[PDB]
Amino acid sequence: RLNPVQLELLNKLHLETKLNAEYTFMLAEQSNWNYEVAIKGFQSSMNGIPREAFVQF
């Protein structure tokens, strides 16, 4: 599980990256859960984040 903060982040970043939140937390976890870094992360390679992740937003 995650902390309440990582939780909020998972949801927030799901919203920021619009990745199905599993890919979001995948990203968000490889990105230390520092938000902006997963922002940098997905949005560094957002053409390569599969559309199952990029979803219908």
Protein backbone atom coordinates (compact mmCIF):
# COMPACT_ATOMS: atom_id res chain seq x y z
CA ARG A 1 0.00 0.00 0.00
CA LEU A 2 0.88 3.65 0.00
CA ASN A 3 0.95 6.47 2.50
CA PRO A 4 -2.01 8.94 2.53
CA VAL A 5 0.30 11.32 0.77
CA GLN A 6 1.39 8.83 -1.94
CA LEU A 7 -2.34 8.06 -2.18
CA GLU A 8 -3.17 11.70 -2.89
CA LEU A 9 -0.25 11.81 -5.21
CA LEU A 10 -1.34 8.68 -7.06
CA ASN A 11 -4.72 10.28 -7.61
CA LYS A 12 -3.34 13.70 -8.37
CA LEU A 13 -0.72 12.42 -10.69
CA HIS A 14 -3.23 10.10 -12.29
CA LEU A 15 -4.86 13.35 -13.03
CA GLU A 16 -1.69 15.03 -14.08
CA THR A 17 -0.31 12.31 -16.31
CA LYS A 18 -3.69 10.88 -17.25
CA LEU A 19 -2.30 7.52 -17.14
CA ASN A 20 -4.31 4.77 -15.88
CA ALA A 21 -3.25 5.22 -12.35
CA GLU A 22 -1.33 1.90 -12.24
CA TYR A 23 1.02 3.28 -14.86
CA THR A 24 0.79 6.48 -13.08
CA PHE A 25 2.03 4.88 -9.80
CA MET A 26 4.50 2.86 -11.75
CA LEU A 27 5.85 6.08 -12.98
CA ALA A 28 5.17 7.85 -9.76
CA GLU A 29 7.07 5.19 -7.82
CA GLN A 30 10.10 5.14 -10.16
CA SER A 31 9.93 8.84 -9.76
CA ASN A 32 10.39 8.73 -5.91
CA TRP A 33 6.79 9.96 -5.37
CA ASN A 34 8.08 13.55 -5.61
CA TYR A 35 5.19 14.42 -8.05
CA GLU A 36 7.05 16.83 -10.37
CA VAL A 37 9.53 14.21 -11.05
CA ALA A 38 6.95 11.81 -12.31
CA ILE A 39 5.66 14.80 -14.14
CA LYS A 40 9.04 15.13 -15.63
CA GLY A 41 8.99 11.39 -15.90
CA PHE A 42 5.82 10.74 -17.88
CA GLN A 43 6.07 14.01 -19.65
CA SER A 44 9.70 13.25 -20.54
CA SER A 45 8.49 10.25 -22.51
CA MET A 46 4.82 10.79 -22.94
CA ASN A 47 4.81 9.67 -26.53
CA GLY A 48 6.16 6.38 -25.34
CA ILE A 49 3.78 5.87 -22.46
CA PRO A 50 1.35 3.28 -23.95
CA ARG A 51 -2.19 4.43 -24.71
CA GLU A 52 -3.61 1.95 -22.32
CA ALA A 53 -1.97 4.36 -19.93
CA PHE A 54 -2.63 7.58 -21.71
CA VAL A 55 -6.19 6.32 -21.77
CA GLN A 56 -9.16 8.41 -22.82
CA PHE A 57 -7.92 10.97 -20.27
